[PDB]
Symmetry: D2
């Protein structure tokens, strides 16, 4: 039994742990400051950027993390929520985290008046997509980024 | 020739013309009072949502539209820009407009100190991708949305 | 353990069993008199179409089915082999049948001089692609069919 | 105004002109004597691998080629036809050959009682997909190939 909740200052290590692990799985290394810079935005009630954690109820251990935020849209008056990061514990298979995390965001999104939630992954990632199809649907869109970015 | 520039109160009548046929192309129908909000945000210096227009330089009229906005990311200190809409008239569409517009967003994105620009389209929108591949690159990302949203 | 072998006349019942199950997975229903035609070709040494089954050693139960055939190319001299159907019993999918059925086809292709093996699957079939990505590689190709077909 | 016909013994040289242009385009170099092989089966009325060329009405010069062939299915009594190669002269692109080349195949397949025609292209081949989309439709398949080949 997993347990999803918003992060507290005392969750900075459990989250920061996964954060580095998430940088590993993805082959990236962000400046050492970003950790704080994000956690700040996560805690400040004015910055519409949240982070949640999946804590193992039977051991008080931080399993997964989910970072999301708000942003406008020229379509519709209501803003939308983007799940920028999602990373469950690499040392445990067939639990429930990620499913429970994606749902927490759905719930918190509904209360905010911005129910429209979205995210993306690598086409190659099939393990994660087993879930995403249960909780969402693959949009027939092709993402395009500026060269060098 | 063609000239790209940010919209002013007077470009609204022209911009809306593109916006309407843009909705036509995408087989959607936004509530007419949404346009007003959009343009409101474009014009507000404080709300980081802009809209540029491609006018037939030395011929007056409008032929292109690009709506974009700034939003935060967990992967970097600086923010990023998302081109939410792009639309040229079915004729002068291929005569430079779309590429000229996408560069405007790049050049402006630079000034803003927030260069990481990005967008997307339907996988089946080949005509547009003939240009997209030049000015930008396809990301190996599949996009997922919440069911019913 | 698992044994993968060519189908004998005595495995028509077992093969047909899975062939039917296979059909409703793919949400299709071929004419009942096609099963025979296939099997007919399977057994005809002169019809370059084969059918291997994965027999669970312990019992005699057939748990796997792989259908493949030979066809020309305009990019080589040696023909290539297409794996048309791959199916492993839902309940007995646990072990590793599908993995060794593809290997069987890999080896038989070698013993035939036409080692170029290939298949295709739905974009959404992530469970299968967890395997296909190991024993093979995704080709940067898009398949197009004639309308009505 | 373009006219498609099955290659004659007197078309081999002009067809070979394309075969090479085609190779360049696809960044490949087939073995020295493959042209002869294909053209062998192309002309043998017992192999079931045809090739047709589109020649200019006035100029009488061969413009494009289309190599296609027959092959079995475990999904039908009828065999499918696969357009293996489609290529138009770069010097003379954006005219009509290709759309007419594919059409020829449809018409010839219909007489053959094997109307189920299909082909492939690189995901990023938007130019050809502007056409493909009009005459066929993207199959939601993902092609996998044997690791080595």
């Amino acid at each position: 039994n997993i347990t999803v909740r918003f992060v507290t200052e005392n969750d900075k290590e459990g989250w920061q742990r996964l954060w580095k692990s998430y940088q590993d799985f993805y082959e990236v290394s962000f400046p050492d400051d970003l950790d704080d810079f994000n956690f700040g935005r996560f805690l400040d009630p004015n910055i519409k950027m949240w982070a949640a954690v999946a804590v193992e109820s039977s051991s008080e251990k931080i399993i997964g993390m989910i970072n999301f935020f708000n942003h406008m849209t020229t379509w519709d008056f209501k803003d939308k929520i983007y799940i920028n990061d999602l990373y469950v514990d690499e040392n445990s298979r067939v639990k429930g985290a990620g499913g429970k995390l994606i749902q927490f965001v759905y719930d918190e999104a509904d209360k905010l008046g911005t129910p429209s939630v979205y995210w993306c992954t690598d086409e190659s990632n099939h393990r994660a997509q087993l879930l995403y199809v249960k909780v969402g649907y693959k949009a027939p869109k092709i993402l395009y980024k500026r060269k060098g970015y």
